[PDB]
Design a protein around this ligand. Structure first.
Ligand SMILES: [Cl-]
Ligand SMILES: [Cl-]
Ligand SMILES: [Cl-]
Lengths: 169, 169
């Protein structure tokens, strides 16, 4: 029934992410640059993706020097920002990107939507194209969208890959 | 190919869940009982699962009468509580179950751990047995635990099923 359809459709998306291992490794590499020095990685999450924050403070793959973005803290060129956002039209995201640009702080943007001009400002972008539901209906509408689940899965991957790199040092 | 390995490990768990469709239906039916009357469904999430809260307020499958548990608010027998917790040993969890018991409010407990006496206090429990990493290390230790991802996937399923049922009415 619904559980099996949702699970199999969700896994379909996980499999197709394998085709973008390189773009995801570009994200990891960008972030790892902070950790080779005395920079920090900051997660700056928007909307529903604010649910990612407890993964860094309370989660099983948490790590020192990967932390929640702090309002009003000036970042520096050695720091790196990981952004998860539902879309790139948000005014709060735009204000943050203007700040990072002024600080010369690089950022990876992971968007639930498609590729946009704003997304292209990121040195390590990823367009998930996963902003519509997985269960189609009668009228052309769709529902059942495990969007936070996808982001959380990706953050687990990123954290695990970063920690694996760090241990190798 | 870390990404593909984590994806396939995670999917292995998704596949075993789909064989527990009946226990998950027990969760959904218990919660749906609130929606027949004037009661509400409350999410009471612990530890890393506090990351689920933004799904109810900002997520794609949000619905009016499924909301975050409120501090100090006395619930009634027509309300329903959905709990996600890393384990059933937490003193805050036990203190909450004592309150719900005093108020005669039914609760569903989804635990990342195994079946316990405390879990069996729930009329609709689910033990995820998903509290150790998916990627073994030389240590014997395990890393890469997409625990929030699983929780978020399950909340999407529950939200989407409650909405489909509510529409049928
Ligand atoms: Cl600087
Ligand atoms: Cl009552
Ligand atoms: Cl026990």
């Amino acid at each position: 029934g619904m559980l099996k359809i949702l699970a199999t459709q969700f896994n379909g998306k996980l499999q197709t992410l394998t085709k973008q291992e390189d773009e995801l490794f570009d994200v990891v590499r960008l972030l790892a640059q902070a950790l080779v020095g005395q920079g920090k990685v900051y997660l700056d999450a928007y909307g529903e993706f604010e649910g990612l924050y407890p993964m860094l403070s309370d989660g099983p793959d948490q790590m020192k020097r990967v932390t929640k973005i702090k309002d009003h803290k000036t970042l520096h060129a050695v720091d790196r920002v990981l952004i998860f956002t539902p879309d790139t039209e948000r005014s709060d995201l735009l204000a943050s990107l203007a700040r990072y640009d002024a600080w010369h702080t690089p950022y990876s943007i992971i968007t639930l939507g498609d590729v946009t001009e704003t997304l292209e400002r990121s040195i390590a972008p990823l367009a998930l194209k996963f902003d519509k539901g997985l269960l189609p209906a009668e009228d052309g509408s769709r529902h059942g969208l495990p969007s936070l689940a996808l982001g959380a899965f990706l953050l687990t991957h990123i954290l695990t890959q970063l920690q694996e790199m760090t241990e190798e040092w």
